[PDB]
Amino acid sequence: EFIVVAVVCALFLWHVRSALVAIISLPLGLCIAFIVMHFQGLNANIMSLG
Amino acid sequence: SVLTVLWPLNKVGGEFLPQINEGDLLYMPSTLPGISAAEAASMLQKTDKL
């Protein structure tokens, strides 16, 4: 998803550290969600992952 | 264009939520109240061969 995303961006920006921007942009957002579930417990069931 | 969706929203195909796939399968029937313990261990071996 990230590379395809990045590939598409590259084409619409004729390449760029967009991928780098992507690793910052979404992985951290994923990370905060991973933290928050832990706060209120919950299980990493398929949907939480889904 | 919205009318075109109202058609689908009123009919909405059918069925709700998903029945998820797990790599294995559980077989459970509607079985009849009374049977021999002998017949049970039998009508299970056969079932485990079919």
């Binding site: 398929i46 949907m47 889904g50 | 998903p18 029945q19 998820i20 796939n21 790599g23």
Partner: protein, 42 residues
Amino acid sequence: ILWGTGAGSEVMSRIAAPMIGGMITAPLLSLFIIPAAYKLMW
């Protein structure tokens, strides 16, 4: 996610589809109905 599933994607589809179909539909919406609606709103 829509044309393949090793394990546990029967669910994602249901939530995914609305995006694609709605996303061929949502941008188009934006292209056209910000102006028409703004000049009509005044």
